[PDB]
Amino acid sequence: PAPLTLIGLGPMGQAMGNALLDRGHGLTVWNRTASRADALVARGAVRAPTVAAAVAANELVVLSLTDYDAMYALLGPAADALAGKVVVNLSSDTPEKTRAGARWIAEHGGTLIAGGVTCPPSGIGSPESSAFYSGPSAAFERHRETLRTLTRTDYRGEDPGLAALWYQIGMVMWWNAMLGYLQAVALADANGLKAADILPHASDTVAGLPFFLRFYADRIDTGHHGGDADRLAMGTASVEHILHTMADSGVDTALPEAVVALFRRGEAAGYAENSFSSMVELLKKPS
């Protein structure tokens, strides 16, 4: 196993450091809050005295930070010593800001590989986990085996904005679903029900969603949103029932209102008799 540097020891960074040590990689770590490296150092990791020494310790530098602005904040002061470094940035950001980070790293002599890890910390090191990757192909294949200690690698191409784009595409569905979980848990609590009580029904509901994703993927791609499978106006009545159920129980309604608002736009565009998938045409319009 190759040696490498890991900067950023939040929930994800902690998990990566433990999985890299599990594999036997000579690991050099650094974190702004130094205390978060203690457990990894006790397991055999080398604590870098500074972030510059961390970068200098290896060719491969992995970052697990909140966003790309934290990269400039951490790597900025000693950016002159980034020449010849391979910076694998596993932080979420937009495709535009991801490209900007790649441009900034190249201008200082390094090369940036963009990554988007699609698993929680407990998923690091497991082969069922995956992560999108885009950036320079040669530098990626040169460090793919080390990156495969963390997750499976899904290389998307040369443009660094690709991995960030793919990460956002899945996360917009994920946050929508999990905020609906909190919304469902809040409704259950107002009626004397726990998250553990609604867990089986909530899990069965989301587990059947792939069948509908497949059924509507083919239909959306033909560009025709016929109301033969479902009628948007019936979806409006359904989400309105959710909203009023929430309000009747005294539960916050901010997100149910936003859902109803989009259906009302679908009806305002004349899509009442078409499938609810027709709203993908409103969603493609700017603003």
List interacting residues with ligand NAP (CB under 6 A): 8-13, 31-33, 36, 64-67, 70, 73-74, 91-92, 117, 120-121, 229-231, 234, 238
Nearer to a second copy, 145 or 252 (CB): 252
How far apart, in Å, are the Cα atoms of 254 and each of 183, 243, 262? Answer: 10, 9, 13
Nearer to ligand Q0R, 28 or 183 (CB): 183
Is 44 in contact with 27 (CB distance < 8 Å)?
yes
Residues facing 157 on adjacent strands: 134
> Which of a second copy, ligand Q0R, ligand NAP, none lies near 32, with the C-beta cut-off 5 to 8 A by kind?
ligand NAP
Is 146 in contact with 1 (CB distance < 8 Å)?
yes
Nearer to ligand NAP, 92 or 274 (CB): 92
By CB under 6 A, is residue 70 in contact with ligand Q0R?
no
Q: Which stretch binds ligand Q0R (CB under 6 A): 59-67, 81-89, 112-120, 140-148?
A: 112-120
By CB under 8 A, is residue 22 in contact with a second copy?
no
Among 39, 73, 169, 268, binds a second copy (CB under 8 A): 169
By CB under 6 A, is residue 54 in contact with ligand Q0R?
no
Residue 127 φ then ψ, to 5°: -70, -15
By CB under 6 A, is residue 168 in contact with ligand Q0R?
no
Nearer to ligand NAP, 155 or 189 (CB): 155
Among 235, 271, 274, 278, binds ligand Q0R (CB under 6 A): 235
Alpha carbons 135 and 235: distance in angstroms, whole number = 41
Task: Give the β-pairing of 60-63 and 46-47.
Answer: unpaired
By CB under 8 A, is residue 196 in contact with a second copy?
yes
What is the side-by-side order of every strand in the sheet holding 111-117? Answer: 46-47, 27-30, 4-7, 60-63, 86-89, 111-117, 130-134, 152-157
Which residue has the closest beta carbon to ligand NAP?
10
> Least CB distance from residue 10 to ligand NAP, whole Å?
3
Nearer to ligand Q0R, 174 or 203 (CB): 174
Alpha carbons 259 and 239: distance in angstroms, whole number = 7
Is 197 in contact with 255 (CB distance < 8 Å)?
no
Binding mask 120-159 for a second copy (x = CB under 8 A): xxx-------x-----------------------------
Query: Which residue is associated with the tokens 């609604």?
Result: 198
Nearer to ligand NAP, 234 or 247 (CB): 234
From the list 277, 273, 161, 153, the residue with the least C-alpha distance to 219 is 277
Farthest CA pair distance, the chain: 65
Among 1, 38, 76, 96, binds a second copy (CB under 8 A): 96
Is 178 in contact with 170 (CB distance < 8 Å)?
no
Alpha carbons 243 and 169: distance in angstroms, whole number = 26
